[PDB]
């Protein structure tokens, strides 16, 4: 997951 | 093509989003992939995005346009199921009931053409  | 639906079934899907949602409140799990055939604007590297859900689909315009390091007078549109949202201040949790997948993710593609070119 990228978590902006 | 080799877009994420392809890379992965659905049911794989629906089980990702179950166990992030289960560890990541207040989180809206999107999809991000540039448009198919759009040679202007770059690729990103991950395309699962946790997004905190009080952002704006106009918002996240602005960290994806960080995120390629677009020229600010660059042409770019991110598009919600492939079209354009009737309104870009919509945030993350307003827009998800409404344009989520069944998979539990909301799906998302930018693309450097406008509705007419």
New interface residues.
């Given amino acids: 997951?990228?978590?902006? | 093509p080799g877009s994420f639906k392809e890379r992965r079934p659905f049911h794989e899907r629906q089980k990702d989003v179950e166990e992030?949602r289960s560890q990541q409140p207040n989180?809206v799990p999107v999809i991000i992939e540039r448009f198919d055939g759009e040679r202007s604007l770059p690729l990103?590297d991950?395309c699962?995005?946790?997004?905190?859900e009080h952002?704006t689909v106009a918002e996240?315009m602005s960290?994806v346009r960080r995120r390629l390091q677009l020229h600010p007078q660059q042409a770019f549109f991110l598009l919600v199921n492939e079209r354009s949202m009737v309104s870009n201040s919509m945030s993350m949790s307003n827009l998800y009931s409404q344009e989520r997948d069944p998979d539990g993710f909301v799906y998302m593609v930018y693309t450097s053409q406008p509705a007419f070119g």
Wanted: glycine share 0%; no cysteine.
């Fill in positions: 997951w990228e978590e902006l | 992030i989180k990103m991950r699962k995005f946790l997004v905190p952002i996240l960290i």
